[PDB]
Amino acid sequence: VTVILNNLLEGYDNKLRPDIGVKPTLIHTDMYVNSIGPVNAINMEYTIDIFFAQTWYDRRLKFNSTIKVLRLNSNMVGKIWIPDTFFRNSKKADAHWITTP
Amino acid sequence: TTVFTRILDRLLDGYDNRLRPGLGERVTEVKTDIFVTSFGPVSDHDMEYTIDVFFRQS
Numbered sequence A: 001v002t003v004i005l006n007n008l009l010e011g012y013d014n015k016l017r018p019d020i021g022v023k024p025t026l027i028h029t030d031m032y033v034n035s036i037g038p039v040n041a042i043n044m045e046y047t048i049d050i051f052f053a054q055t056w057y058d059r060r061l062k063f064n065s066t067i068k069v070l071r072l073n074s075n076m077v078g079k080i081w082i083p084d085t086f087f088r089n090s091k092k093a094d095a096h097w098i099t100t101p
Numbered sequence B: 001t002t003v004f005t006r007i008l009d010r011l012l013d014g015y016d017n018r019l020r021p022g023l024g025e026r027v028t029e030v031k032t033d034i035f036v037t038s039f040g041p042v043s044d045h046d047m048e049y050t051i052d053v054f055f056r057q058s
């Protein structure tokens, strides 16, 4: 499996999105809301905790093997292109880093 | 000493932390233990509570 990951990362440019010169990158988004926190009417804001998932296609990361799926923690998240998704109306947003990312 | 240094240096040669132990062979079993040093204050205004823990995983 290490060979597969090394081959995928070999000759990979994470600065460029997939289909950079072909078509828009289609991303399918999912949300699971754990809790909509208290609504601060004084500040006009509300806290919300979510599991945010994004699915897209990157033909650069194609691999032919019997594994059929590589399940990985955050370690390679910085090694590939990730969407630039941000929340437009978020006064403050934080990711979680305990125990690990 | 020399034996200690060579053991430490050569331990991770050819090691991939991206993969869990026993990937494709078995299920990784983790034994968990918690020692609550101090059950922190419970915040009614937040539905929140703090707890200081020594968290052990084997």
Ligand SMILES: *[C@@H]1O[C@H](CO)[C@@H](O[C@@H]2O[C@H](CO)[C@@H](O[C@@H]3O[C@H](CO[C@H]4O[C@H](CO[C@H]5O[C@H](CO)[C@@H](O)[C@H](O)[C@@H]5O)[C@@H](O)[C@H](O[C@H]5O[C@H](CO)[C@@H](O)[C@H](O)[C@@H]5O[C@H]5O[C@H](CO)[C@@H](O)[C@H](O)[C@@H]5O)[C@@H]4O)[C@@H](O)[C@H](O[C@H]4O[C@H](CO)[C@@H](O)[C@H](O)[C@@H]4O[C@H]4O[C@H](CO)[C@@H](O)[C@H](O)[C@@H]4O[C@H]4O[C@H](CO)[C@@H](O)[C@H](O)[C@@H]4O)[C@@H]3O)[C@H](O)[C@H]2NC(C)=O)[C@H](O)[C@H]1NC(C)=O
Binding pocket: A074, A075, A076, A077, A078, A079, A093, A094, A095, A096, A097, A101
């Ligand atoms: C002005 O100046 C300030 C101060 O300098 C500056 O603020 C700083 O901004 C930078 C971003 O620009 C920020 O750096 C990143 O932090 C990432 C981790 O989280 C850190 O923050 C969390 C939470 O802090 C935030 O909390 C609030 C929001 O939630 C809010 O206050 C802020 O946003 C705040 O930042 C914190 O919990 C973390 O604590 C630790 O745990 C991290 C675990 O990943 C670890 O990286 C940290 O070093 C740190 O670990 C030590 O401390 C803990 C205890 O706190 C101990 O338990 C540990 O043992 C350590 O002693 C962090 O503080 C951090 O992950 C970023 O580094 C990752 O990403 C960058 C960018 O991609 C990479 O270059 C890094 O290599 C690294 O990427 C690896 O890991 C990710 C997964 O996390 C993988 O996806 C990557 O592929 C990669 O892993 C692969 O490669 C590496 C080698 O590259 C390899 O080792 C791996 O095995 C693997 O192969 C980055 O450091 C910084 O924290 C922040 N400083 C502050 C706030 O003090 C401003 O930006 C400046 N402003 C301007 C405009 O200039």
